Amino acid sequence: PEFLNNTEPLCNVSGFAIVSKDNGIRIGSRGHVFVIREPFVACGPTECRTFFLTQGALLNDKHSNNTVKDRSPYRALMSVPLGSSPNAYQAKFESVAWSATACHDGKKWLAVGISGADDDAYAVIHYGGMPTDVVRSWRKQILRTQESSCVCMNGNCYWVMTDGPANSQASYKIFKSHEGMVTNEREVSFQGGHIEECSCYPNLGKVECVCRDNWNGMNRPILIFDEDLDYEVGYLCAGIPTDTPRVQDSSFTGSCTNAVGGSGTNNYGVKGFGFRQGNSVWAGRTVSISSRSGFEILLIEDGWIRTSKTIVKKVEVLNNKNWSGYSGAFTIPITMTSKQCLVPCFWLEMIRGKPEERTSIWTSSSSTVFCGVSSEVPGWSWDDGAILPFDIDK
Amino acid sequence: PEFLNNTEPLCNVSGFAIVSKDNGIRIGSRGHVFVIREPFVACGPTECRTFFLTQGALLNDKHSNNTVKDRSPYRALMSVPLGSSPNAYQAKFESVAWSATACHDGKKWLAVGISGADDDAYAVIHYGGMPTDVVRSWRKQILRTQESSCVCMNGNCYWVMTDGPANSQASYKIFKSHEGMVTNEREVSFQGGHIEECSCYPNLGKVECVCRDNWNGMNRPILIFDEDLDYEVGYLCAGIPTDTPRVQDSSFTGSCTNAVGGSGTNNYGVKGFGFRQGNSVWAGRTVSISSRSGFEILLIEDGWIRTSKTIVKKVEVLNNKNWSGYSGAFTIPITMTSKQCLVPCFWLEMIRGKPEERTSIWTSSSSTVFCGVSSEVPGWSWDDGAILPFDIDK
Amino acid sequence: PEFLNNTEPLCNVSGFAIVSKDNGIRIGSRGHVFVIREPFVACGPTECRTFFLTQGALLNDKHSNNTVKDRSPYRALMSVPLGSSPNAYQAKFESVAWSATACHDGKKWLAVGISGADDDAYAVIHYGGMPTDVVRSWRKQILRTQESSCVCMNGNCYWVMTDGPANSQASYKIFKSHEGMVTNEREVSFQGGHIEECSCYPNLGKVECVCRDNWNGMNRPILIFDEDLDYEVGYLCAGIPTDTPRVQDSSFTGSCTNAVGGSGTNNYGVKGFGFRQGNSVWAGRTVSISSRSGFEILLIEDGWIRTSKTIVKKVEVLNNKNWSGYSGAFTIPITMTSKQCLVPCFWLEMIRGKPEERTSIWTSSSSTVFCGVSSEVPGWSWDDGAILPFDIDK
Amino acid sequence: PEFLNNTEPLCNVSGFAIVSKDNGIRIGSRGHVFVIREPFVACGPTECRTFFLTQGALLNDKHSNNTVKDRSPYRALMSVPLGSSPNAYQAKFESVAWSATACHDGKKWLAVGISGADDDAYAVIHYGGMPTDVVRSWRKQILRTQESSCVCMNGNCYWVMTDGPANSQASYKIFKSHEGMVTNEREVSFQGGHIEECSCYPNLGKVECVCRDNWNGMNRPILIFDEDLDYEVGYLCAGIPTDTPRVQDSSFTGSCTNAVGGSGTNNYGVKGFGFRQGNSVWAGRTVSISSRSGFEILLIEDGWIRTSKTIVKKVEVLNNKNWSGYSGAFTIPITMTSKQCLVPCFWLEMIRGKPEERTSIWTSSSSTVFCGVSSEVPGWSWDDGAILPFDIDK
Ligand SMILES: CO[C@@H]([C@@H]1OC(C(=O)O)=C[C@H](NC(=N)N)[C@H]1NC(C)=O)[C@H](O)CO
Ligand SMILES: CO[C@@H]([C@@H]1OC(C(=O)O)=C[C@H](NC(=N)N)[C@H]1NC(C)=O)[C@H](O)CO
Ligand SMILES: CO[C@@H]([C@@H]1OC(C(=O)O)=C[C@H](NC(=N)N)[C@H]1NC(C)=O)[C@H](O)CO
Ligand SMILES: CO[C@@H]([C@@H]1OC(C(=O)O)=C[C@H](NC(=N)N)[C@H]1NC(C)=O)[C@H](O)CO
Ligand SMILES: *[C@@H]1O[C@H](CO)[C@@H](O)[C@H](O)[C@H]1NC(C)=O
Ligand SMILES: *[C@@H]1O[C@H](CO)[C@@H](O)[C@H](O)[C@H]1NC(C)=O
Ligand SMILES: *[C@@H]1O[C@H](CO)[C@@H](O)[C@H](O)[C@H]1NC(C)=O
Ligand SMILES: *[C@@H]1O[C@H](CO)[C@@H](O)[C@H](O)[C@H]1NC(C)=O
Ligand SMILES: *[C@@H]1O[C@H](CO)[C@@H](O)[C@H](O)[C@H]1NC(C)=O
Ligand SMILES: *[C@@H]1O[C@H](CO)[C@@H](O)[C@H](O)[C@H]1NC(C)=O
Ligand SMILES: *[C@@H]1O[C@H](CO)[C@@H](O)[C@H](O)[C@H]1NC(C)=O
Ligand SMILES: *[C@@H]1O[C@H](CO)[C@@H](O)[C@H](O)[C@H]1NC(C)=O
Ligand SMILES: [Ca+2]
Ligand SMILES: [Ca+2]
Ligand SMILES: [Ca+2]
Ligand SMILES: [Ca+2]
Cα dihedral A25→A26→A28→A33 (10° resolution): -50
Domains and CATH numbers, chain C: 1-394 (2.120.10.10)
Distance from CA of D96 to the nearest CA of C (A): 6
Residues 6+ apart with CB under 8 A from A199: A146, A148, A209, A210, A211, A271, A272, A273, A274, A327, A328, A329
Q: Is B319 helix (H, G, I), strand (E, B) or coil?
A: strand
In this structure, the residue with its CA closest to atom 12 of ligand 9 is C62
Among A60, A65, A68, say which to mutate for ligand 5: greatest number of ligand atoms within 8 Å of CB: A65
- Our answer on whether the CB atom of D114 is closer than 6 Å to any ligand 4 atom is no
Alpha helices (runs of H) in chain C, residue ranges in sequence order: 24-27, 334-337
- What are the strands, taking DSSP E only, across B195-302? 196-203, 206-212, 221-225, 231-235, 274-277, 280-285, 293-300
Which residue in chain B is spatially nearest to A339 when comparing CA positions? B132
Residue B142 backbone class (left: φ over 0; alpha: ψ -120 to 50; beta: rest)? left
Q: From which experimental method does this structure derive?
A: X-ray
- In this complex, which of D17, D22, D336 lies closest to A122 when CB atoms are compared? D17
Backbone φ, ψ for residue D25 (5° rounding) = -75, -40
Q: Is C220 helix (H, G, I), strand (E, B) or coil?
A: coil
Q: Do the Cβ atoms of D225 and D231 come closer than 8 Å?
A: yes
Give the separation between CA D69 and CA D137, rounded to whole angstroms. Answer: 21
- One-character DSSP codes across A191-210: TT---EEEEEEEETTEEEEE
Give the separation between CA D362 and CA D61, rounded to whole angstroms. Answer: 10
Name the pairing type of β-strands D196-203 and C280-285.
Answer: unpaired
What letter does residue C98 receive in the DSSP assignment? Answer: S
Q: Do the Cβ atoms of A85 and A33 come closer than 8 Å?
A: yes
3-state helix, strand, coil in chain C (%, to 5): 5, 45, 50
Question: Is residue B22 less than 8 Å (CB to CB) from chain C?
Answer: yes
Give the separation between CA A122 and CA B181, rounded to whole angstroms. Answer: 45
Give the separation between CA B37 and CA B324, rounded to whole angstroms. Answer: 12
Give the separation between CA B202 and CA B10, rounded to whole angstroms. Answer: 7
Q: Do the Cβ atoms of D331 and D201 come closer than 8 Å?
A: yes
Give the separation between CA B29 and CA B35, rounded to whole angstroms. Answer: 11
Residues of A annotated as catalytic (active site), given as ranges = 70, 326
Query: Do B48 and C117 count as a contact with CB atoms less than 8 A apart?
Result: no
What's the gap between Cα D70 and its chain centre?
16
What's the gap between Cα D99 and its chain centre?
11
Give the separation between CA B106 and CA B128, rounded to whole angstroms. Answer: 11
Ligand 5 geometric centre to CA of A353 (Å): 14
- One-character DSSP codes across A309-357: --EEEEEEEEEEEEE---EEEEEE-HHHH--SSBEEEEEEEEEEETTT-
| CA nearest to D373, candidates A105, A112, A185, A136 | A136
Residue D222 backbone class (left: φ over 0; alpha: ψ -120 to 50; beta: rest)? beta
Distance from CA of C19 to the nearest CA of D (A): 6
> Cβ contacts (< 8 Å) between D336 and chain A: which residues?
128-130
Cα separations (Å) of C374 from A135, C13, C377, D349?
55, 5, 9, 37
Give the separation between CA C308 and CA C303, rounded to whole angstroms. Answer: 5
The ligand that comes nearest to the alpha carbon of residue C361 is 9
Which chains have 3 or more CB–CB distances shorter than 8 Å to chain C?
B, D
Mutate to test the interface with B, among C27, C55, C58, C63 (most CBs of B within 10 A): C63
Q: How many CB atoms lie within 10 A of CB A355?
A: 11
Give the separation between CA C48 and CA C345, rounded to whole angstroms. Answer: 11
Give the separation between CA A373 and CA A377, rounded to whole angstroms. Answer: 8
Q: Do the Cβ atoms of B154 and B3 come closer than 8 Å?
A: yes
Question: Is residue B339 less than 8 Å (CB to CB) from chain C?
Answer: no
Please state the residue numbers annotated as binding site of C: 37, 71, 196-197, 212-213, 217, 243, 268, 292
Question: Any known ligand binding at A208?
Answer: no
Backbone φ, ψ for residue B249 (5° rounding) = -50, -45
Backbone φ, ψ for residue C393 (5° rounding) = -80, -15
* Radius of gyration over every alpha carbon of chain A, rounded to an integer in angstroms: 19
Q: Do the Cβ atoms of B220 and B212 come closer than 8 Å?
A: yes
Question: Is residue D389 less than 8 Å (CB to CB) from chain A?
Answer: no
Q: Do the Cβ atoms of C267 and C259 come closer than 8 Å?
A: no
Residues of B annotated as catalytic (active site), given as ranges = 70, 326
Give me the amino acid identity at C122.
Y
Distance from CA of D60 to the nearest CA of A (A): 12
Residues 105-124 of chain A with CB under 8 A from chain D are 115-117, 120-122, 124
Cα separations (Å) of C90 from B81, C34, C81, C111?
11, 11, 8, 18
Give the separation between CA A100 and CA A119, rounded to whole angstroms. Answer: 17
Give the separation between CA A244 and CA A265, rounded to whole angstroms. Answer: 8
> Cβ contacts (< 8 Å) between C96 and chain B: which residues?
18-21, 382
Give the separation between CA C172 and CA A70, rounded to whole angstroms. Answer: 69
What's the gap between Cα D202 and its chain centre?
15
| CA nearest to B50, candidates B74, B19, B72 | B19
Residue B309 backbone class (left: φ over 0; alpha: ψ -120 to 50; beta: rest)? alpha
Cα separations (Å) of B69 from B36, B59, B118, B392, D57?
11, 15, 13, 18, 41
Give the separation between CA C394 and CA B287, rounded to whole angstroms. Answer: 40
Which residue in chain B is spatially nearest to A385 when comparing CA positions? B74
Mutate to test the interface with D, among A54, A59, A63 (most CBs of D within 10 A): A63
Give the separation between CA A189 and CA B186, rounded to whole angstroms. Answer: 58
Cα separations (Å) of C369 from B211, C18, C41, C341?
52, 6, 8, 20
Residues 6+ apart with CB under 8 A from A358: none
Backbone φ, ψ for residue D63 (5° rounding) = -70, -5
Give the separation between CA D84 and CA D41, rounded to whole angstroms. Answer: 12
| CA nearest to A179, candidates A103, A105, A112 | A105
Query: Do D93 and C87 count as a contact with CB atoms less than 8 A apart?
Result: no
Query: Do C385 and D56 count as a contact with CB atoms less than 8 A apart?
Result: yes
Query: Do A56 and D371 count as a contact with CB atoms less than 8 A apart?
Result: no
Residues 6+ apart with CB under 8 A from C14: C313, C373, C374, C375, C376
Ion ligand 15: protein residues whose beta carbon lies under 5 Å:
C 213, 243, 269
> Cβ contacts (< 8 Å) between D342 and chain A: which residues?
none
Q: How many CB atoms lie within 10 A of CB C2?
A: 10
Question: Is residue B31 less than 8 Å (CB to CB) from chain C?
Answer: yes
> Cβ contacts (< 8 Å) between B133 and chain A: which residues?
373
Among A361, A391, A393, A394, say which to mutate for ligand 5: greatest number of ligand atoms within 8 Å of CB: A361
Task: Give the 3-state DSSP-derived string for D63-124, with helices as H, strands as E and coil as C.
Answer: HHCCCCCCCCCCCEEEEEECCCCCECCCCEEEEECCEEEEEECCCCEEEEEEECCCCCCEEE
Which strands sit side by side in the sheet containing A231-235, from one edge to the other? A196-203, A206-212, A221-225, A231-235
Angle at D116 between CA D110 and CA D118, to 5 degrees: 115
| CA nearest to D17, candidates A138, A95, A145, A118 | A95
Q: Do the Cβ atoms of A210 and A241 come closer than 8 Å?
A: no
Count CA atoms closer than 13 A to A306's CA, side-chain side.
7
Which chains have 3 or more CB–CB distances shorter than 8 Å to chain A?
B, D
Q: Do the Cβ atoms of C97 and C53 come closer than 8 Å?
A: yes
Q: Do the Cβ atoms of C13 and C374 come closer than 8 Å?
A: yes
Entry resolution in angstroms?
1.6
- Give bridge partners of residue C48 from the DSSP assignment: C43
Distance from CA of A361 to the nearest CA of D (A): 16
The ligand that comes nearest to the alpha carbon of residue B204 is 8
What's the gap between Cα B178 and its chain centre?
22
* Sign of CA pseudo-dihedral C210, C216, C219, C223: negative
- One-character DSSP codes across C55-88: EEEETTSGGGTTTT-S--TT-EEEEEETTS--BT
Query: Do D18 and A74 count as a contact with CB atoms less than 8 A apart?
Result: no
The ligand that comes nearest to the alpha carbon of residue C374 is 10
Which residues form the pocket of ligand 6, taking CB atoms under 6 Å from any ligand atom? A 9, 11-12, 278, 341
Cα dihedral A259→A264→A265→A268 (10° resolution): 120
Count CA atoms closer than 13 A to D344's CA, side-chain side.
30
Burial class of residue A228, CB neighbours in 10 A (0-12, 13-18, 19+): exposed
Cα separations (Å) of D171 from B156, D28, D38, D71, D112?
71, 38, 22, 20, 19
Give the separation between CA D350 and CA D291, rounded to whole angstroms. Answer: 12
Cα separations (Å) of D24 from A91, C268, D367, D383?
13, 47, 8, 12
Give the separation between CA D81 and CA D87, rounded to whole angstroms. Answer: 11
Q: How many CB atoms lie within 10 A of CB B80?
A: 22
Q: How many CB atoms lie within 10 A of CB B183?
A: 12
Burial class of residue D189, CB neighbours in 10 A (0-12, 13-18, 19+): exposed
Among A7, A10, A12, A300, say which to mutate for ligand 6: greatest number of ligand atoms within 8 Å of CB: A12
Give the separation between CA C125 and CA C157, rounded to whole angstroms. Answer: 11
Backbone φ, ψ for residue A94 (5° rounding) = -115, -45
Name the pairing type of β-strands C231-235 and C171-178.
Answer: unpaired
Which residues form the pocket of ligand 11, taking CB atoms under 6 Å from any ligand atom? D 62, 65, 361, 392
Q: Which atom of ligand 5 is nearest to the CA of A65?
A: 1
